[model samples]
Target: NLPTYKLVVVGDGGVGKSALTIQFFQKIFVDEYDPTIEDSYRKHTEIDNQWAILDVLDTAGQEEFSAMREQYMRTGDGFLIVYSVTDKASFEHVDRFHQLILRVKDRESFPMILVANKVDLMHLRKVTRDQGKEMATKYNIPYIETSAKDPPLNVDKTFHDLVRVIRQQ
Candidate 1:
């Protein structure tokens, strides 16, 4: 039997967390203001040959939800740390998420994918791909930028690459 992997999505709110997930799952971008109170989990089928499960946990981005975020970090097998390319503050806070994951997992080593969402808005980009890559190198995580709006953006490939990393570990 193929091993099950717990994939968690962590990032500041309004960074297209639900948008990206919905686009990946339903192939439609449902724009709505549905705030994740605690967290939302979804299991997905993989395009790769492995029969793996993706538990995508969408956590609240509010400051009050810090403890709740920590809870998810403890249970996740791997993480996709997202930040809006148009929002510099969100990008700067990515390290906080990394630190929290390190503390909760009680290990310095774990697989993580640093995602810079909203790449379609390149004109408004506050976080460059190189900047994200540099941070990924510093922390030793995979990095990729994706846009939920573009059909050719390769969301499936992003997830597939992520699963490959998880499986290799």
Candidate 2:
């Protein structure tokens, strides 16, 4: 029997949270991005030679949905806190999300990963690799660089890595 993991993606608006999720599950990137209200996706896939059900939650990152954030955070077995390398504010908020997750789970530590998205926008990049790693280090979480554009980079690896992190506990 396959195990199941609930993964919640948290990030500020326009950080390509939905793009990464859709690309991982659909294999196509929609350039015309739309703000998500809330979306759930399920996939039965192989990871480390074992099959597992990945139930992912993609929710609105807008301030309007701030009230609902903790509700979903409580449901996740693991989390991918995403921030676009191009947006300093999103990067700054990583700490906020990380602390909130731990608070919601009522744990000193939990399964989570720091995701630096839109790395493909090299010229537009505002957050450095070292900076991303530094924040990850501060929180003791895994750090990954991902670009959900065509020929996606680390799109699958990100999710798989989080599952591996969850499996560790």
Candidate 3:
């Protein structure tokens, strides 16, 4: 039997967490999204005869959410740490985020995927694919750059790949 998995979407505020989650769940992209008021959870249906469950939790990126992050961290089986490709500050926070995950969960080997979102903004790209891959390697997580705005951008591949990783575990 396929195992069920809990997936969490985490990152700083305005890093497109809602966009990615909505795109994944609804199959449509909304460029203008209202920021998440609080941590929200949703379960996605399994794909390809698999029994996997994506427990997507969108957490607040503000200081108020710091205390609550630990609880969320403990419940998830895997995480998608997202940051916009056009934002350098967001990219730079990956290390801090990783550290927090480790501290909160006390798990050294949990599955993680580093997602560089908004890759469609190639003209304003602040981080290159190589740089994203390098960060992934440094932190030992799978890496992928994606754009939710365009067709054939492999948005599904992102979640499917994580499903694959969770299955392997």
Candidate 4:
């Protein structure tokens, strides 16, 4: 059996977490703003020179499902803390997720990446790339900008990088 990673996607509602997840596993663009309850997908793939299985959870971003957050948080090997660049509020919520992960794991830190999503909406962007990087720096974690649009940007790299992060720890 190959190595396996349980990666979780976290963000405020409508931050395109599902879009990023779906794009990675399905390779298609979905523009709808459908709120997720929680969906898990598994895929076998190669990263770097190694092959492994990815168990990705595209979890609920809505407050109604907030009760289930810690249950899944406890299972992740790594995480993608996503925030829509167009929504400053989502960006502000990143630290909450970051801290929650550590609290659940009871570790000084964990494998995670700060994802600034919806950069495709350039005209509506409220959060800058530098802001994302600064926050990542504050937490000492890697950062990335992504868009799960027709031409997905950093969607694949994001997942691969987290796998790299997990492998290190």
Candidate 5:
């Protein structure tokens, strides 16, 4: 109940950043988005398994400027760097973003999670589950494949699991 964790949710623009944030709170898929919360949003959530607010900052359209980027990097307590299962290009940026996070934080290892979003549409997927696992294994971070729409996998557990990891750190 004492800690207010800074949870950073990041990825490409259309990779369901807003949707995931909304889902984390509402616990259901979100088709209608609140534009005001698009750039930055906060949710009062449990810390790992106990009571506390999780400060989730979703990078919707704010990753363009270097200043904003570094500020997020410097401030985040834990991170969920999301990628799309159907978007091949999204996975390509995973290493780049991970490196940037480590560089900005000036830390070799941090509390982070790799998320493969939009996994419900497996038919259109370009990146497979094994690929996601491979990437997560490369970084030694926990991984989960989540969907914001129909058929949920790890959408609920991702935040909770990451918070637990942060607490462990």
Candidate 6:
């Protein structure tokens, strides 16, 4: 009950950060991409048999917000950095976001997750699981693949798994 956190979801716009974050919290998959610049939510959740409240920020489309987004991210206790497996550019941009995390947090490495979203569209996927996993290795963070539109494809585990990391840190 005492442990709680602020987790910020960050990615290139259209990477499905909102969808995944919303799915984990609300249990509903948004089929479309009409999204606000930022969406805030808090959910009482449990991870690894432990309980905590998570204040989640489904953030702005990152490319357009530099000054504000940089400051916005530093306040988070953890982060979920997403990339669409179906989009190659988004996958390539993961490094930039990860660097930003390091800069904003002012730490070499902190609790974070590398998420490959939109896994349900496998045929459309341009980023391989090995590629995503390799990126995780390069970043030294946990990686999880998620298909928010498809049920039970590591959405909750990504959250809970990152919670575990944040807790350990």
Please report, in order, the local distance difference test score of every candidate based on alpha carbons: 0.79, 0.93, 0.78, 0.94, 0.80, 0.85
TM-scores for all candidates?
Answer: 0.90, 0.98, 0.89, 0.98, 0.88, 0.94
Q: For candidate 2, write residues 1-169 as lDDT tens digits.
A: 7899999999999999999999999999979868887888999999989999999999678979877876877899999999999999999999889888999999999999999999999999999999999999999999999999998999999999999999999
lDDT of 4: 0.94
lDDT of 5 by residue, 20-112 (tens): 877777777877744322355566666435876777887653355545656765888988999889988889889987997898788999999
Per residue, candidate 3 scores C-alpha lDDT tens digits across 48-98 of 676665667777666577677667777877788888899899999988888
Pairs of residues clashing in candidate 3 = none
lDDT of 6 by residue, 39-70 (tens): 67888876767789988888876566666777
How does model 3 score by TM-score? 0.89
In model 1, the clashing pairs are none
Q: Kindly report which residue pairs in candidate 5 clash with one another.
A: none
Candidate 1 structure quality by residue, lDDT tens digits, 1-169: 6566777778897887777777777788756767664655566475566577676666777667778778776888888888989999989999998998888888987878888898988788888788989988889888888888856375766767778888888
Model 5 stretches astray by more than 4 angstroms: 32-38, 47-49, 61-66
Clashes of each: 0, 0, 0, 0, 0, 0
Q: How large an RMSD does model 3 have?
A: 2.0
